[PDB]
Design an enzyme around this catalytic site. Structure first.
Site, short mmCIF file in Angstrom:
data_model
loop_
_atom_site.label_atom_id
_atom_site.label_comp_id
_atom_site.label_asym_id
_atom_site.label_seq_id
_atom_site.Cartn_x
_atom_site.Cartn_y
_atom_site.Cartn_z
CB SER A 1 109.31 12.13 -42.84
OG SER A 1 108.87 10.89 -43.35
CE1 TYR B 1 109.59 13.14 -48.06
CE2 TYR B 1 109.93 11.17 -46.72
CZ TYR B 1 109.22 12.30 -47.01
OH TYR B 1 108.12 12.62 -46.27
#
Lengths: 260, 260, 260, 260
Positions: free
Chosen positions: B147, B160
């Site tokens: 990400s 996350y």
């Protein structure tokens, strides 16, 4: 629908600077095999003749030009000549460069400046010369040949490391400034690549041992290892990859090293 | 001689975790179009049935399995089943994951741990389960979906970001530990990708304005933008690319941003 | 006017997790010498007694607590006890951690998970427990002990590398989420530090040769090398340094290595 | 035993290039307050007189020299003069530089080259001139003022970004090549620092809003924010910090940004 055609360079023109032999020649050869028309330059006719003969032997009709990459007027004229005789440059690979190995305090200001001029200022000059027609074409690719020295330093290579560090950031800047105009500017950062020059270091060697231990892949790289990544960055398959340095090093930059 | 065949996945088997829809489905679809046989898992039959119907509609005969990625025994059994029914997994894409948006001090230890378990521990479990047969096959690829949060933090996404940061380093570790055995483990780091969920933020919007300004390419990414880079990393064309995070972000991570 | 007083920790309270010996103890000792009041925890009374005796011998009246860093309820109670008995924690150093060296495919899911829980989830738990009072105090510092494994992988240390990579990104996230509230969260990334455990590798050695060659400074680091950087990050002198990993490695991460 | 004296520059000489005003002046002022003797240069007498008067007003007896940083012969002579009149330079801060804002394709080769010469080649020249005496002294520090443009690109600043990217790698190279000789060469990478020039962008502003949103600390930086980190890198407290770029940006480089 995705198609493998996204990797194809069919109907595109690529300029690979200094691509008479070595890494640039290998990249240009892969480009031709991917469908591209190849144009290249080098500093003298002897080098151009060498590249031309080698392209011919590989079944490639390349277009070769004598030009110094640090000569803006020269490069400008070259691009104009390429556009009249071959067509619009879709893909530029800034491959031309030099390296010098001098302890920093021993290196002359002139020598340092020359390495910077060729390895950093010249990629700016050539990029500047190709970008306007890429914008008008609606798509362009610029691939800058960086180095592990874009990331890590070493005794004797201060000028080279400085220039390649600059080239890394130039890459990211062009990406930022021209990405909107559908220019993707990326880097290829080769690992330890086995060239004619390092062959005695592979004689049946402590330096060979050094490289293999640093490399998870447990071998020197070869010019052939750069071909797929280079074609990728030049192709539609990487259109949303921009300002990125693609390291092709078998895992070196990711590895702490093989300890005894 | 270089060949575009280097990008082909013909005769290879790819497992894409959680590939019932979204990014994983798009990557698996590109893989099939590149010649691969597709296997995928998800947590329940409903999701598996959804993926199966969607693959079928796209002309793909995928193989779908019900399995929780955090269940080592389950995954081990799944791989064994895949090997008996389909064949050896050549390519693993660790795509399955979750995201939670909770201010850090408000997030429960259980919630944090669950995000870590799914997004970090599970890619370790699945990698571990596929690597032994890849070694025996003489070649393997593991692609970890990272990400921009593998690089940059943000309010509400602490768990996350932590897990994706871990996944980035897990990627580099696997590269280092197994590169010698001809395993290439790399990352794909998507930029801002336009999903069904962010559609109201594109209503004819300040958030839309935010993204476009951050992105040199001046648009949201789409799942389709990940297809070429994903196929690249799964293919012979990237054999000397290892422990590398390939960011596909239109230039975001390279850009300071569009200032007023 | 700038003052060297900006580096002083006078009148501040620091919690250094697992600081009974080793790196944490050295950092806590420097903190005390910089003016701080020292609190620390460890898993059992034996370790706490060890730390207490060692602080006393160095002229430091530390405050020691028995607590498992993975026990949120335990840590919450500990912070409450510290606040009633000593005062508000101004500075947290997440130092507690473990390392395991197991080939990845040989490592159990339980073992991997335990390393993640202690080295990644626990720093989240302790950070969460201290941040609310830091916000109310008007200033806080969180220093996460990372590693070169926050950047580079190695055979046998997959879990450790994953957790430290996660901790690097957790650091950047906390910086982003709480920087507004005047919390500075940074990392210290030690290089190769000579501990009691690596002493036989320095016997009058190929491993010793390996380290020295990787390190521009041409020596192992020592715990003492971390003291100045740690005090810096805990002090007013670094108030605009946030989400930054400060590597203290004598130049390792900057160096390609000493080749033969 | 650790001591706060490790941060002291007492009895050391620092050369800060172009330190007549702005960031360099603030760093030199902090150095003096930390105990250092200050020497500085600038391109003309007017700037030198300005710096001298400002140092005097702050209670600092600085030593000012007229010299162009791109003039190797000039710098060499200056160092020799400094050594005869003041003493050995223990600490060099490469602060002198220029910025230009021109769209890349519109920028002349001469203009690009001038930015490179001043911001990259000149730090090499000055470093080269001070290093031999640092080696003989048994300790040296070189601090290179980098930028966020050492990491991220932006329209109009191609030359500046290229030079600062180069300076980042020059920093890492000097660290690698001279770390063995007890030279620590590091970078300071300031975030958005509020200078006289950006004051109208803070009028009671969309640009102001832009910066604050990018910065976790939720404010512009000030020159004062650089003082502690600069003194740190110049001091014994950072002796095992080498080839490191210390970003002082309130969390910008760590943050995805404040989204609406």
């Amino acid at each position: 629908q995705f198609s493998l055609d996204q990797f194809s360079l069919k109907g595109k023109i690529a300029l690979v600077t200094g691509a008479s032999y070595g890494i640039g020649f290998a990249i240009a050869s892969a480009y031709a095999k991917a469908g591209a028309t190849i144009v290249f330059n080098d500093i003298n006719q002897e080098l151009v003749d060498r590249g031309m003969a080698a392209y011919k032997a590989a079944g490639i009709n390349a277009h070769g030009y004598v030009c110094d990459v640090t000569d803006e007027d020269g490069i400008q004229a070259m691009v104009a000549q390429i556009e009249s005789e071959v067509g619009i440059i879709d893909i530029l690979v800034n491959n031309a460069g030099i390296i010098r190995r001098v302890p920093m305090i021993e290196m002359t200001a002139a020598q340092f400046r020359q390495v910077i001029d060729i390895d950093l200022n010249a990629p700016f000059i050539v990029s500047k010369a190709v970008i306007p027609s890429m914008i008008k074409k609606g798509h362009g690719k610029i691939i800058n040949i960086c180095s592990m020295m874009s990331e890590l330093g070493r005794e004797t290579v201060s000028a080279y490391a400085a220039a390649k560090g600059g080239l890394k950031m130039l890459t990211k800047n062009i990406a930022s400034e021209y990405g909107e105009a559908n220019i993707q500017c990326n880097g290829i950062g080769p690992g330890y690549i086995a060239t004619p020059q390092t062959a005695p270091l592979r004689e049946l060697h402590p330096f060979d041992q050094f490289i293999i231990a640093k490399t998870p892949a447990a071998r020197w790289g070869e010019a052939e290892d750069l071909m797929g990544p280079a074609v990728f960055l030049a192709s539609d398959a990487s259109n949303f990859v921009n300002g990125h340095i693609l390291y092709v090093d078998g895992g070196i930059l990711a590895y702490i090293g093989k300890q005894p």
